[PDB]
Design a protein around this ligand. Structure first.
Ligand SMILES: NC(=O)c1ccc[n+]([C@@H]2O[C@H](COP(=O)([O-])OP(=O)(O)OC[C@H]3O[C@@H](n4cnc5c(N)ncnc54)[C@H](O)[C@@H]3O)[C@@H](O)[C@H]2O)c1
Ligand SMILES: NC(=O)c1ccc[n+]([C@@H]2O[C@H](COP(=O)([O-])OP(=O)(O)OC[C@H]3O[C@@H](n4cnc5c(N)ncnc54)[C@H](O)[C@@H]3O)[C@@H](O)[C@H]2O)c1
Ligand SMILES: NC(=O)c1ccc[n+]([C@@H]2O[C@H](COP(=O)([O-])OP(=O)(O)OC[C@H]3O[C@@H](n4cnc5c(N)ncnc54)[C@H](O)[C@@H]3O)[C@@H](O)[C@H]2O)c1
Ligand SMILES: NC(=O)c1ccc[n+]([C@@H]2O[C@H](COP(=O)([O-])OP(=O)(O)OC[C@H]3O[C@@H](n4cnc5c(N)ncnc54)[C@H](O)[C@@H]3O)[C@@H](O)[C@H]2O)c1
Ligand SMILES: [Cl-]
Ligand SMILES: [Cl-]
Ligand SMILES: [Cl-]
Ligand SMILES: [Cl-]
Lengths: 268, 268, 268, 268
């Protein structure tokens, strides 16, 4: 209700999906929230619906959009307390031979270097407020994922970069943490499934990947982000898993293209 | 303020230290808190100071004290929503040749089997409320600690048991999570340091073990416990680090009894 | 062929399964191997087949069998270079309400305290040879397993205790490491499956739990143990996964008793 | 001696340091080793000294040097069994405000995309031999490092990409693993220390970061690489730590620029 009252928070990719759930969660905690998104439609709708949230058109891959975002946030609101690096993209499934260096580079621009660029420009102001940084990584950065070599690499980089930043910024009292969601039901998840030959079978497999038996919601990642910013004052460099237990226990991992012998020869 | 309002919460070892900070944090969230402690003095003081907290004398190593704790909590309050297994002990430093099987067993009774016994008796009621279990483990369960083989083993067991329980209880919607604190300034920490030849040098070394440059507070573990119980509905089987970054980066690890060559032979 | 030539190695539970594969692997490397097992049949067969391997009847839960094992190994062979703590048991599936404290204690005696007791008595001799300790833990110590709360706890304890020992013993140059196998086709695995209503379906599910699409073999854990003892001179406190990738990627984790909604409500 | 006899192995950055130790280790195991390095001097010396090792001038950041490397390896030797992606660079210490996007990109080209490019072109031939990939990551990819945000990110990416590749390639039986060294005494380590105001104090701090009390040697990473290629047939997607225990236990983590209170206020 007031656990982050009056703090200024920038959320990239805040126009829909997990980012919108983060935006709403910080607004509910009393923060001034600057929505950064390359897409005007969702951000403008959130800005008009939510007082306390304002929208600034900004592509995190463009160094000058991020410089203007930072310049305007300070110019209009006087401080910066929290940066949530959520803007990111997951390509459709691609085998390694179906990936290109050019595509990998483009994905690093958004998923990693957008996060790096905003953080670097935000730090001189976060140091002044003893603010904090929250990166939205992914569970697959930690455990891998099939048909997603470029995406998995960008998220492995984000999680590692979070720890290096935590070390670099701890002398100023600036905490740097990441959230690693598993399967969260979002427009991105829906758009990816709709590319499959059986979208709802894909969605059901995504639900069965969790011991809890469902996907997560954006509001649940949002609650984790407000916790990290407002009540985790002894946490830095941590990776907070919001995954429904997907990393626990044994499961069916041999793919449908993987030769598997009958169970009379169990170990080759 | 009301994020866990009316839920019934049992906290073992709640009379002082981290447990008291957990008790206060749940009371602040609106819960009915049953303080379990073998020591009457601290629990009675908390119970008299805090309405909403009641004290029940209980040694978690005694199966009948735990059975009576559970029987009385239901008998008096009608439900059980959350169990926080915090009761635990850290022995003074002991080299491996200075440990005994008898001492190891006694430590397993408190640190592991007390946690197991209460959880087992609580589950039939937690299943009915879709409640959750929170175990207080330790960072050293994950990274080890010098001169603490028995203690480190009990906490490794608690963290692993948390994940097995999460898998066993997810079909009922019961979440099971643990918090792994690093260095938290508590009466236990103070009593251990006071056994050293230079207690404040020991305390200062405990502060320098964190990039943040201080130890944590019980209230910070308490905020993490209320988060897990009340707002982490997609988290199960996680290990939430409350460590001030102590696990990050390189540090001075070669002990004062460890032969180290001069830097003209860096790799042997 | 000679990578561990003349070193003296004790292997508990070496009469069959993973332990026998470890015994054979060290014999192949040139070691004198002392087979410790409570079962005479398998150890005597290995001792008669393999010169270099000798069998000593020994139950690791009995402090005096372990004291006599150690006393006889030195008395007969003059040194001790390596201890492989492999003796362990996995109970049939048991829900948490189907476990007892008495059964948990008995399992801690074998899986944890047997490992502790031998290590403690072996260390004064390992310190003299700059030898090393290898503990056989389990992947489920790290990621959990359904219907195995006591077993998972003992293996979490072993992995953690390995790191504490590594810290305590590094000033003597004694390395302490563990191997965490996933699904290894052994007599134990076969006996557990044979208790299921469809044993070969269970075995097939055990094979499909790995991206590689099969279970491991004892010889593969054996090759990992000889590596740790003979060529990993900069490794201590590590957990070497021999799992076929079972911990990677998403899989089917929602159990057959877990209510799962249809895919039109993916996140509750 | 013959544990990898006749297999063809490509090692990038094999002209000195860890790569040279990997080259020598595979040559000792009987392999045909193709040394890839941008620097002619070290590779030519290894090629002339070691029969079985041949040198091919190749910059892994240049797609056509890697295409020619692959084309020539097959053209000259008929098969490809193992790729060791070792070529990498660690910049001098740099605070985050002292880094540039342009420098970050250049470092991603070498440390990540060089590894990606060679792997992609090698896979059609590794699939035919059921070969394997070994990536040389770094412990700091897992735990972070001060003043190295770009470097730490590239190594986090490599470790994650290793797991995604392991999942993508397991249906062909191709294993993909990484080694994460800690402090290894190499020419790179020496050149970085020589940039410090007190190089040998820096080297000594690098030695004290390990419980073992020394840095590792290239030959020790080399032994780990031959193990992964030749005897770890049930290992895929693993991260093999060669760190001397640097990740274990508590150490001095508060930096010399970090305000730390006196020990009479231990937790703020
Ligand atoms: N959905 C999941 O299951 C899941 C799982 C793990 C991690 N994540 C991560 O969470 C984040 C959000 O995912 P989502 O599922 O909510 O996705 P989404 O596609 O639903 O929303 C992402 C938002 O970011 C914006 N955005 C994209 N590129 C941008 C750019 N260049 N500059 C500024 N804004 C940009 C989009 O316009 C959109 O509003 C991503 O980083 C994603 O990788 C998602
Ligand atoms: N203090 C730290 O730095 C630290 C770090 C990591 C983990 N932990 C863990 O946190 C927990 C609490 O630690 P603390 O520092 O607050 O300790 P503490 O000694 O300050 O308080 C522990 C409380 O538990 C009670 N207790 C002990 N044995 C009991 C028993 N048999 N039955 C019931 N109650 C019993 C004690 O009377 C006391 O009130 C422990 O499990 C400890 O291992 C502490
Ligand atoms: N098989 C797997 O898939 C698997 C997976 C992970 C870990 N492990 C672990 O590997 C180890 C060996 O497992 P396995 O599958 O080879 O089992 P196993 O039952 O096939 O063989 C275990 C051996 O240990 C001996 N032993 C048992 N109790 C003993 C005692 N008290 N004293 C001395 N010897 C004793 C038995 O007689 C037997 O010879 C165990 O610690 C087990 O938990 C096995
Ligand atoms: N030395 C350590 O303590 C340490 C620790 C962790 C990880 N590592 C990693 O191990 C690897 C080797 O490190 P090192 O200490 O042996 O370094 P090094 O500088 O001693 O040797 C690296 C070699 O790679 C070559 N190389 C560099 N750029 C290249 C390019 N574009 N194309 C082809 N070859 C190229 C260099 O010419 C050199 O021969 C790197 O990936 C490094 O990040 C090293
Ligand atoms: Cl996957
Ligand atoms: Cl320690
Ligand atoms: Cl399981
Ligand atoms: Cl560091």
């Amino acid at each position: 209700g007031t656990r982050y009252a009056g703090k200024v928070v920038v959320v990239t990719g805040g126009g829909r999906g997990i980012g919108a759930g983060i935006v709403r969660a910080f607004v509910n905690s009393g923060a001034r929230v600057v929505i950064c998104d390359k897409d005007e439609s969702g951000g403008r709708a959130l800005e008009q619906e939510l007082p306390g949230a304002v929208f600034i058109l900004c592509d995190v891959t463009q160094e000058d959009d991020v410089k203007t975002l930072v310049s305007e946030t300070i110019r209009r609101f006087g401080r910066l307390d929290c940066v949530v690096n959520n803007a990111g993209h997951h390509p459709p499934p691609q085998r390694p031979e179906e990936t290109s260096a050019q595509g990998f580079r483009q994905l690093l621009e958004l998923n990693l270097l957008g996060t790096y660029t905003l953080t670097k420009l935000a730090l001189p102001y976060l140091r002044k407020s003893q603010g904090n940084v929250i990166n939205i990584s992914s569970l697959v950065g930690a455990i891998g994922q099939a048909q997603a070599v470029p995406y998995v690499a960008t998220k492995g980089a984000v999680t590692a970069m979070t720890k290096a930043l935590a070390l670099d910024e701890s002398p100023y009292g600036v905490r740097v943490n990441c959230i690693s969601p598993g399967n969260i039901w979002t427009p991105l998840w829906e758009e990816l499934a709709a590319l499959m030959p059986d979208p709802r079978a894909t969605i059901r497999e995504g639900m069965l990947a969790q011991p809890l038996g469902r996907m997560g919601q954006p509001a649940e990642v949002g609650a984790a982000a407000v916790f990290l910013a407002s009540e985790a004052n002894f946490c830095t460099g941590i990776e907070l898993l919001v995954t429904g237990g997907a990393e626990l226990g044994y499961g069916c991992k041999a793919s449908r293209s993987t030769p598997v012998d009958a169970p009379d020869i169990p170990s080759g």
